[model samples]
Target: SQEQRQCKKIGEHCYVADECCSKRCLFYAAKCVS
Candidate 1:
Protein backbone atom coordinates (compact mmCIF):
# COMPACT_ATOMS: atom_id res chain seq x y z
CA SER A 1 0.00 0.00 0.00
CA GLN A 2 2.83 2.41 -0.76
CA GLU A 3 0.60 4.47 -3.04
CA GLN A 4 -2.07 4.90 -0.39
CA ARG A 5 0.42 5.67 2.37
CA GLN A 6 2.89 7.87 0.49
CA CYS A 7 0.93 9.58 -2.29
CA LYS A 8 -2.08 10.37 -0.18
CA LYS A 9 -3.07 14.00 -0.76
CA ILE A 10 -3.58 15.95 2.43
CA GLY A 11 -4.09 19.64 3.24
CA GLU A 12 -1.58 22.51 3.28
CA HIS A 13 1.30 22.86 5.76
CA CYS A 14 4.10 25.27 5.07
CA TYR A 15 7.32 25.11 7.11
CA VAL A 16 8.75 27.81 9.35
CA ALA A 17 11.58 29.89 7.97
CA ASP A 18 13.75 28.92 10.92
CA GLU A 19 13.30 25.19 10.37
CA CYS A 20 15.49 23.07 8.07
CA CYS A 21 14.56 21.05 4.93
CA SER A 22 13.38 18.10 6.99
CA LYS A 23 10.94 20.32 8.89
CA ARG A 24 9.85 22.21 5.79
CA CYS A 25 8.94 19.07 3.83
CA LEU A 26 5.52 18.23 5.28
CA PHE A 27 2.83 19.39 2.82
CA TYR A 28 1.14 17.90 -0.26
CA ALA A 29 3.97 18.41 -2.73
CA ALA A 30 6.58 17.56 -0.13
CA LYS A 31 4.92 14.25 0.66
CA CYS A 32 4.52 13.50 -3.06
CA VAL A 33 8.21 14.05 -3.76
CA SER A 34 9.34 11.97 -0.81
Candidate 2:
Protein backbone atom coordinates (compact mmCIF):
# COMPACT_ATOMS: atom_id res chain seq x y z
CA SER A 1 0.00 0.00 0.00
CA GLN A 2 2.49 2.54 -1.16
CA GLU A 3 0.07 4.44 -3.35
CA GLN A 4 -2.47 6.97 -2.16
CA ARG A 5 -5.91 6.05 -0.79
CA GLN A 6 -8.58 8.22 -2.34
CA CYS A 7 -10.15 11.67 -2.53
CA LYS A 8 -9.40 12.59 1.07
CA LYS A 9 -6.90 9.77 1.32
CA ILE A 10 -4.69 11.90 3.48
CA GLY A 11 -6.83 12.20 6.58
CA GLU A 12 -5.57 15.27 8.30
CA HIS A 13 -6.36 14.10 11.81
CA CYS A 14 -10.10 14.46 11.44
CA TYR A 15 -13.05 14.03 13.79
CA VAL A 16 -15.58 12.25 11.46
CA ALA A 17 -15.57 9.89 8.44
CA ASP A 18 -16.61 12.74 6.22
CA GLU A 19 -13.14 14.13 6.85
CA CYS A 20 -11.36 11.28 5.04
CA CYS A 21 -11.90 9.51 1.77
CA SER A 22 -13.11 6.35 3.45
CA LYS A 23 -16.66 6.51 4.72
CA ARG A 24 -17.31 6.23 8.43
CA CYS A 25 -13.88 7.06 9.80
CA LEU A 26 -12.52 5.47 12.91
CA PHE A 27 -14.43 7.60 15.38
CA TYR A 28 -12.79 5.70 18.21
CA ALA A 29 -9.37 6.02 16.55
CA ALA A 30 -9.79 9.75 17.10
CA LYS A 31 -8.77 10.58 13.52
CA CYS A 32 -10.45 9.65 10.23
CA VAL A 33 -8.48 6.45 10.19
CA SER A 34 -10.81 4.65 7.91
Candidate 3:
Protein backbone atom coordinates (compact mmCIF):
# COMPACT_ATOMS: atom_id res chain seq x y z
CA SER A 1 0.00 0.00 0.00
CA GLN A 2 2.95 2.33 0.61
CA GLU A 3 4.00 2.19 -3.03
CA GLN A 4 0.42 2.72 -4.18
CA ARG A 5 0.16 5.72 -1.85
CA GLN A 6 3.44 7.44 -2.57
CA CYS A 7 3.90 10.95 -4.01
CA LYS A 8 0.17 11.56 -4.26
CA LYS A 9 -1.61 14.88 -3.69
CA ILE A 10 -4.24 16.02 -1.25
CA GLY A 11 -7.03 17.84 -2.97
CA GLU A 12 -9.83 19.92 -1.48
CA HIS A 13 -12.10 18.07 0.99
CA CYS A 14 -9.99 14.93 0.78
CA TYR A 15 -10.00 12.77 3.93
CA VAL A 16 -7.56 9.89 3.53
CA ALA A 17 -3.83 9.17 3.80
CA ASP A 18 -3.83 7.75 0.28
CA GLU A 19 -5.14 11.09 -0.87
CA CYS A 20 -1.93 12.81 0.24
CA CYS A 21 1.72 12.25 -0.52
CA SER A 22 3.19 12.13 2.98
CA LYS A 23 1.26 11.42 6.16
CA ARG A 24 3.39 14.20 7.66
CA CYS A 25 3.34 16.60 4.72
CA LEU A 26 5.89 19.43 4.61
CA PHE A 27 5.71 22.32 2.17
CA TYR A 28 8.57 24.53 0.98
CA ALA A 29 8.77 27.21 -1.69
CA ALA A 30 5.22 26.35 -2.73
CA LYS A 31 6.31 22.76 -3.28
CA CYS A 32 5.04 19.72 -1.39
CA VAL A 33 7.77 17.40 -0.11
CA SER A 34 7.83 14.43 2.24
Candidate 4:
Protein backbone atom coordinates (compact mmCIF):
# COMPACT_ATOMS: atom_id res chain seq x y z
CA SER A 1 0.00 0.00 0.00
CA GLN A 2 1.16 3.47 -0.89
CA GLU A 3 0.27 6.05 1.67
CA GLN A 4 0.41 9.78 0.96
CA ARG A 5 3.01 11.21 3.22
CA GLN A 6 2.84 14.96 3.71
CA CYS A 7 5.78 17.22 4.28
CA LYS A 8 6.47 18.14 7.86
CA LYS A 9 6.11 21.75 8.99
CA ILE A 10 8.83 23.80 10.58
CA GLY A 11 10.12 22.63 13.95
CA GLU A 12 8.76 19.16 13.29
CA HIS A 13 10.82 16.04 13.54
CA CYS A 14 12.02 14.74 10.19
CA TYR A 15 14.41 12.02 9.12
CA VAL A 16 15.63 14.09 6.19
CA ALA A 17 15.56 17.73 5.16
CA ASP A 18 13.48 17.00 2.08
CA GLU A 19 10.73 15.58 4.29
CA CYS A 20 10.06 19.06 5.63
CA CYS A 21 8.20 21.90 4.03
CA SER A 22 11.14 24.22 4.57
CA LYS A 23 13.41 21.57 3.06
CA ARG A 24 15.79 22.12 5.93
CA CYS A 25 15.98 19.53 8.61
CA LEU A 26 18.31 19.89 11.53
CA PHE A 27 20.05 16.54 11.30
CA TYR A 28 21.64 16.81 14.72
CA ALA A 29 18.40 17.94 16.37
CA ALA A 30 16.36 15.54 14.25
CA LYS A 31 13.81 18.22 13.43
CA CYS A 32 12.91 20.72 10.75
CA VAL A 33 13.43 24.35 11.66
CA SER A 34 13.16 27.63 9.85
**Model 4 off-target regions past 4 Å?**
1-6
Tens digits of per-residue lDDT for model 1 on 1-34?
A: 3543321333324343223333434534443123
Q: TM-score for candidate 1, please give it.
A: 0.16
Backbone clashes, candidate 2? 1
- Off-target runs (Cα >4 Å) in candidate 3 are 1-13, 24-34
Residue clash pairs of candidate 2: 17-25
| Model 1 bad stretches (over 4 Å) | 1-22, 31-34
Ranked candidates (lDDT, high to low): 4, 2, 3, 1
Q: Global lDDT of each model?
A: 0.34, 0.60, 0.41, 0.79
lDDT string, candidate 3, 1-34, tens digits = 3556345544322244444555443343233333
lDDT of 4 by residue, 8-31 (tens): 876688888877877879778788
Q: What tens digits encode model 2's per-residue C-alpha lDDT throughout 1-34?
A: 4995564454556577777666556667755553
Could you tell me which 10 consecutive residues in candidate 2 have the lowest summed lDDT? 4-13
The per-residue C-alpha lDDT of model 2 at residue 2 equals 95
Score candidate 4 by lDDT: 0.79
TM-score between candidate 3 and the true structure: 0.25
Instruction: Assess every candidate by TM-score.
Output: 0.16, 0.37, 0.25, 0.56
Lowest summed lDDT over 10 consecutive residues: which window, candidate 1? Answer: 4-13
